[PDB]
Amino acid sequence: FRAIIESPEGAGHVGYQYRRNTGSTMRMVSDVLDERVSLWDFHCDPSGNVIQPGPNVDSRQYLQAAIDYVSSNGGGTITIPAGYTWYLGSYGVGGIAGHSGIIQLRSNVNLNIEGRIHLSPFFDLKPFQVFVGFDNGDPASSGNLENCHIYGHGVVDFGGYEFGASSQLRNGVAFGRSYNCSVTGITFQNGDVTWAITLGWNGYGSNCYVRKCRFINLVNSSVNANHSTVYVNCPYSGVESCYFSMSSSFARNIACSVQLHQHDTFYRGSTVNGYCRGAYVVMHAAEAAGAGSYAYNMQVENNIAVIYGQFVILGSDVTATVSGHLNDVIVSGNIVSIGERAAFSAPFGAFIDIGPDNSGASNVQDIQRVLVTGNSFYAPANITDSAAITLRANLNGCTFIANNFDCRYMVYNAPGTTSPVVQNLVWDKSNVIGGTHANQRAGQNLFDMQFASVVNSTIEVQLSCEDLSMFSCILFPASCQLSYSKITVDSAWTKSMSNTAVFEGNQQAGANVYVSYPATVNLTSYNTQGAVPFFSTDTNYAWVTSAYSLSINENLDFSPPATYTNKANGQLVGVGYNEIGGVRSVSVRLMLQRQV
Amino acid sequence: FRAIIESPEGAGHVGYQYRRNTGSTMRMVSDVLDERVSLWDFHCDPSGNVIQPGPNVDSRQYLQAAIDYVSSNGGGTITIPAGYTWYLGSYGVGGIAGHSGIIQLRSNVNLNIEGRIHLSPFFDLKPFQVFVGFDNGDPASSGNLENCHIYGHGVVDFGGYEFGASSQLRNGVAFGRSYNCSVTGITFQNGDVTWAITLGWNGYGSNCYVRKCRFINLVNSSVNANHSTVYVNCPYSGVESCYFSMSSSFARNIACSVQLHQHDTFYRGSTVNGYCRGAYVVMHAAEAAGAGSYAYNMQVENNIAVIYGQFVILGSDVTATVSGHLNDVIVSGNIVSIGERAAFSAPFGAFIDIGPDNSGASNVQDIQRVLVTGNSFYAPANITDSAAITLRANLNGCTFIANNFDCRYMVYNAPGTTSPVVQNLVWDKSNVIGGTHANQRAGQNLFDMQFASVVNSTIEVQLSCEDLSMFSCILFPASCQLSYSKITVDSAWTKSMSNTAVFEGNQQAGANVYVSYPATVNLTSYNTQGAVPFFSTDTNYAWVTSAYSLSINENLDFSPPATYTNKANGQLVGVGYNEIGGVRSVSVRLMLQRQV
Amino acid sequence: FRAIIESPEGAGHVGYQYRRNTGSTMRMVSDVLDERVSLWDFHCDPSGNVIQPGPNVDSRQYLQAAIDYVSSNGGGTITIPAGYTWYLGSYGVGGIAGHSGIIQLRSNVNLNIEGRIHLSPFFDLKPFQVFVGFDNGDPASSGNLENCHIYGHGVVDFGGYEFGASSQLRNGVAFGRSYNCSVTGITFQNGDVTWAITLGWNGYGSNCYVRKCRFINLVNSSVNANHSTVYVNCPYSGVESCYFSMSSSFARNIACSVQLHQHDTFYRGSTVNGYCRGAYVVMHAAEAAGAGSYAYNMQVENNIAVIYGQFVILGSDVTATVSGHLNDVIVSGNIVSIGERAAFSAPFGAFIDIGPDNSGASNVQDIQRVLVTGNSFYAPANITDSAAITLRANLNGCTFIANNFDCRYMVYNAPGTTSPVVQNLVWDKSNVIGGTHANQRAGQNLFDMQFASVVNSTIEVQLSCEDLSMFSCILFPASCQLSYSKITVDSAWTKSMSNTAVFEGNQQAGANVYVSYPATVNLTSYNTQGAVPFFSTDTNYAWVTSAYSLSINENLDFSPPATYTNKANGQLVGVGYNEIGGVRSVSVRLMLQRQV
């Protein structure tokens, strides 16, 4: 009996009944211990003796053995115990080797990480993906991962190692073709990695989430080619209530917090500091296998960010046989700023970017039905390269309502570069343009419409303070066609502006262009006492449907017309009043209107 | 000693002291095992031998025994172990029998569901409510359920069984008269049920929540009368971060995700696919016992939905002795679309519906102080039956600001049908009207004001693209009274429209009606050289306070007035200018204005 | 052997191997029991015998012993067992004694509170802070607390005791200089306390959160000086999805739910009832040591509140050597109401308050770049002291877009009192002004601009119903300078108003003031048949750049001008038309415009 009791089967001979309840199961101690499982149950030598973790012990095979066994019983939760650091020191084998995998995840096997998991210097300068849910080196031939959750108060620490080569890939958790999988509560820190977590594979997967995680200092070298902390590559998936921080200079040029790359995905309630970018919202044709060619129902909401480049980047692209489409997006409630930096020291600052594809093409995109509403954006006054929207590729629609943008440009695209075709750009009068960059805008147009064409668009400009440094509120080069559009410049704070709206190709004459903006006009009357016509000297007003005074009349003996219409020769004309006769000559600020 | 050790009291004789710490309690193994409890501790035959769960074992009595016992000790958490499916195969007894109850929940007893709970075919074609928190067949005589939480990574599977009769009810969790109760993390799937979860009872309860749950395929037959996945019937309660999906055709006609039926309730951050409806926000008089007659502080926010009917439905109704009121509602940040379907193939598509009561009455409602802001809505171009708001019953107020609606109608109600009395309908100019349905609107009015009366309302129409197919932007039949209102149609994209605003009863003449909209007007001048009057041919402008040109003047020898006022006979009149004399005749596009 | 087995080392001699797996560690029962730890493991007398908790047992030393021991092993989670109430009955010792501390928290030691923790009457009328993370009486000399989480379904009950003196402080959890600490799921109830939870210390700390907690009835006496349920005094920290309720009358005058006092902090998705205030968003100079002098990236979003005073209070202040600044704030998606109360029975009701410092100074603040968007506010019609914004101290900017405010005042500040200097106040036309207080406003100005000066501001007034009781829509006293501003009053529902906008110092004449508002004007024409001038009788219109008719013309034989400009003597003048000659005299409603 003593022998049995001291043997590994001893607990299986000690009887137990819950709280001495006579109606409860007569069990053995081992049965109750068998209800939970930890790494300690597999972290042993060939003779079954427990091995202490530490920097000179590779815990990988033990952890894999745990996962494999629990998988065999239909699943469960393995605890990685608190108060210990568990080092990983070799690559895994089989299907995950194609993915430089360390640990293979398996369906229904959750990890409750309370302790710390730390990479050993075996991985210095090498690729790695710490946890991998694919079961095949080729993801297309991989089975699925289902019902796998990683959670706890613990830590995945990437050991600080730099990348060995830019072409290398590194990841924390790749769930694979992942259905009902999640990461909750975990801190990922101290690396130079490509991603911390990836969800799904080219649209295959569903209901994957990252919640209440922290990601701290995950880029550290110039070798790192590119970093996106969470890539969401399956639908009905998202990121909520996370914290993302970088301190590296390199992160300000390369790192993004989230990629939303399939339909019905979201990014909410998170805080970001030290990153180049906030989120991509993208349909890559190359990734359309699992869930279709459309990214729709895309939500970026209630985030806080200090970034150095662009907050939300929109795009879609094509392959030889597939075309990607992006539609039905909402960006709302976010408060974002470009952090302190020199002008042009990082990628061009923006709230929204319409980004050309990875080859630079701006004529492949099919982006539409986007609503950008109730956001704040700020950039410091020196950051010339800051815009509410950098509109650098074809756009089929984007709607701005009730935002507050306080940066250098409202709408921008660089001249010379791409010439996007623009449709359904709506900038509602309820967008408030801040004043931080007042006096900085010499030579610049607030809305610099450097496009091939604009159609079915609305730009309602409303200033909230003066900025007499700007060349114009809005300017269209002669190369930009403009049709079936509404372009207005509210008069407030514009009295002293030389140019308000500028149409370098006189595009405001178009049949279906609806405009209004202030201008100064010289007029001269006839001599006649009484009701008397005033006519503009210039003849550039053939497009004007009505105009009205924005100036007081300092005279007693006459008054100019309150309102004007035009004449076939391009003059304005209205009827004023000469109390006493005489030819009058006045220079008046008018609101020019066309079909409005 | 050997006998004691092998007995069910053996663990109570093996000493233990935590980590060999001399300051720790000298305990027995059984004490430490007694700190947790699982179904295995009650899942045993009369001789105390453990019984394996499976399809031919009814786990119900064992689970009830666990709950009952733990209840007796002041509560705790029972685990339902992972890696096992636990079948339920009979009805419960006593107080829950009135509710077709299987398991009775008890206060302070939490269930940590890690495994799967599955209904056996005993329940095929029968009613059932799996977990029930009432303790009496009559809910009015029921005690409360308090501090009961169901959580975990497991699954409640309803076995796929269809309803036997439409009158049957089926539920997953009925918390009852429920205070501080919740469901977190659980997947409900594979049924034909009425509800998955219900919270509270007719206003009794508080602080009940459903968080991070999934609801998958919970309608499957034509027998199912009606389905609402979560019913929230107690205050200070809500639904957050959940996932709702249906695949059945029947779900598109019958199923709703959430009912918010008491004050201080919310529905946020959730994704819905395949449902008819998103949420009801309702005060039923019949349900006002526990928390009063007012549903206020109702929040629907930051959800993603593809539905087939209406997203948010507002209502309130009355009984012989109680009147229900709905006020102080916010609907914001939601991105919603009507899924691909034929016109009229499901209930009429809408973002907001003002729904008549269950008997069809439209004159019982008291709905007011609603804010609908910063939402997106889309319906495909063929879906004739799509509206920003279907306003089908009396409305005492609803405010729309800064939404983006892209569907067939903005405001709609069917003619012939109900004639709602409308007050305080506010449609701010910052609502962007999309263009998906451009060219589809022959015979239709964008804002079809098919009401008994409208008062204290604002409709500011702003197009963003042309749609010359529409009969009018806004139309009031002669049967609709209109007073103390503002109705404007911005001119942009309307130059070629025959009708902009239409008042079939000439209601725009009312003393306290403030309007403006474009119109084409024929004018003829007197002969006089110099300042010369132009007068409209028609005499239908007695209501007009001013009008101004929206057309250019192609002439050299004269110009029409820039502006006009009226004359008692209904003509317009203004002063233009004949450089040379002669009677002039022109047809001009004017902005007609009344008291604006 | 029997002796060993019955000894406290007995479990260390019973072998166990997980599920009889031959590849698993050969362990001893004690090893597996050692994987978890509870209060029962320390809740024992000097002889190691377990002691039952209860009202006459002080559990404090036992709980401290547990925390201390687990701390010694690098951390872990101590469970406070369900089904027991654990009373605390004495003060702690050492470093926490300076903080009236009961229990000292330690790094990496989590508490899983499933049972109830209750204060014994030893604490009646005494200060206390139940859990304290400082390790020194002087917080400046304190070490940090890291990785400390308190979570569970249990309860901290403050025993109902009143404060003994107003100067006393009481707290639930003070995390101290706290990094990666949180409270989740816990109910705090039944006290008279200063705070329930405090996070950080004067900017030191990071990543501290309070989530899914309840706070119930935490003020109960007139002695209580001040109450704020959660104070957030470290960056990258916040409050989400919590419930706050008070029932005391005193709470309506003293209690606030949240203080956000450092950068990158948030308050979201919470419900508040019975409180005076919702949140302070503040930079106290006195608290700038740990994270700088700027509070930026401040987010208050998607909350539900019934309060009696002010919802969000903004401020910043200075010390002898430090100046605090507040910028980059977003307040959105909140639905708030002032609960039923008499006028002036609690602190003045407001959605936003710009509050003077604790000494009453209104000239120390540096508050700017605030966006208040997509919120609802309501106050009952009798509550005279209700405002969208009480603007009581210097303001460097605040932007309102697309809110719905339904209360007595829009903008208010009491006359006589403070004279704030106001810059960059933007009130967009998309703010909807409700009608609840229509007919209550005798003697009152809707926008009562009781400031020293206003600059670079926009007030676009839009009514949605009539309120002829109000003295004016907007009024500027002569003492308020006004420059570089836009002030408009839309005409809708104003026809019958005697005063619309009132400039008691004729400030609308300023060179860079842009205004428009309705007025009634008497005009008289010359005799001349044909085109004929009309001139105002009054000469108060020297500032007017144009005016246009808002009235119909009931006459046949003539018409007044549609539009007007001015003359140097301050008259208006326009050209109408006498079909037949004669001097005309008319009283017309005009839209007066200046530079707009």
Ligand SMILES: CC(=O)N[C@@H]1[C@@H](O[C@H]2O[C@H](CO)[C@H](O[C@H]3O[C@H](CO[C@@H]4O[C@@H](C)[C@H](O)[C@@H](O)[C@H]4O)[C@@H](O)[C@H](O)[C@H]3O)[C@H](O[C@@H]3O[C@H](CO)[C@@H](O)[C@H](O)[C@H]3NC(C)=O)[C@H]2O)[C@H](O)[C@@H](CO[C@H]2O[C@H](CO)[C@@H](O)[C@H](O)[C@H]2O)O[C@@H]1O
């Ligand atoms: C860091 C990051 O994610 N950046 C975004 C861009 O991602 C694109 O580049 C990445 C560079 O790291 C990825 O490519 C790299 O990795 C590929 C995948 O690795 C293979 O497959 C894995 C499943 C295995 O485990 C690996 O062992 C390996 O075999 C590899 O094929 C590439 O050669 C390599 O460079 C990223 O690739 C995606 O990664 C996810 C997550 O792991 C995976 O689920 C996908 O299957 C995989 N996709 C593809 C096509 O391989 C690759 O997409 C991203 O393109 C960009 C979006 O913005 C641009 O495009 C927009 C749309 O046109 C445009 O609007 C915008 O302006 C553009 O800048 O955003 C980040 O830069």
Ligand SMILES: CC(=O)N[C@@H]1[C@@H](O[C@H]2O[C@H](CO)[C@H](O[C@H]3O[C@H](CO[C@@H]4O[C@@H](C)[C@H](O)[C@@H](O)[C@H]4O)[C@@H](O)[C@H](O)[C@H]3O)[C@H](O[C@@H]3O[C@H](CO)[C@@H](O)[C@H](O)[C@H]3NC(C)=O)[C@H]2O)[C@H](O)[C@@H](CO[C@H]2O[C@H](CO)[C@@H](O)[C@H](O)[C@H]2O)O[C@@H]1O
């Ligand atoms: C599926 C669903 O919930 N639909 C919504 C409507 O709910 C209404 O019909 C339901 C049909 O299933 C419910 O009625 C059914 O159930 C009743 C309750 O069951 C009894 O009581 C339980 C406590 C016991 O456990 C049961 O054993 C049983 O005894 C039963 O009395 C009815 O006879 C039966 O048809 C639903 O009833 C509510 O259910 C909740 C949750 O279980 C419960 O807490 C309530 O006490 C109970 N209420 C009542 C009054 O019984 C019943 O409300 C819902 O009416 C509708 C709202 O929209 C309509 O009304 C709006 C306001 O006028 C109007 O704006 C809109 O246009 C209308 O369509 O939304 C769903 O259809």
Ligand SMILES: CC(=O)N[C@@H]1[C@@H](O[C@H]2O[C@H](CO)[C@H](O[C@H]3O[C@H](CO[C@@H]4O[C@@H](C)[C@H](O)[C@@H](O)[C@H]4O)[C@@H](O)[C@H](O)[C@H]3O)[C@H](O[C@@H]3O[C@H](CO)[C@@H](O)[C@H](O)[C@H]3NC(C)=O)[C@H]2O)[C@H](O)[C@@H](CO[C@H]2O[C@H](CO)[C@@H](O)[C@H](O)[C@H]2O)O[C@@H]1O
């Ligand atoms: C209840 C509450 O928090 N009210 C808010 C105001 O807080 C200010 O008053 C509080 C009164 O309780 C606090 O002061 C009290 O406590 C101080 C701290 O206790 C000391 O230090 C602790 C760390 C130890 O554990 C204690 O043992 C003790 O030694 C004490 O020094 C004060 O003497 C006492 O009155 C509150 O103090 C802060 O407390 C937090 C949390 O514990 C702590 O992290 C801070 O270090 C500590 N700060 C300071 C400076 O001591 C104190 O701040 C708050 O001022 C107000 C904001 O609104 C006003 O100011 C705005 C900006 O000018 C203005 O816009 C607005 O209109 C004003 O009303 O909001 C609440 O009233």
Ligand code: NA
């Ligand atoms: Na690979």
Ligand code: NA
């Ligand atoms: Na849009």
Ligand code: NA
């Ligand atoms: Na071009």
Ligand code: NA
């Ligand atoms: Na029943």
Ligand code: NA
């Ligand atoms: Na409203």
Ligand code: NA
């Ligand atoms: Na009628």
Ligand code: NA
């Ligand atoms: Na102190």
Ligand code: NA
């Ligand atoms: Na602002």
Ligand code: NA
């Ligand atoms: Na002054």
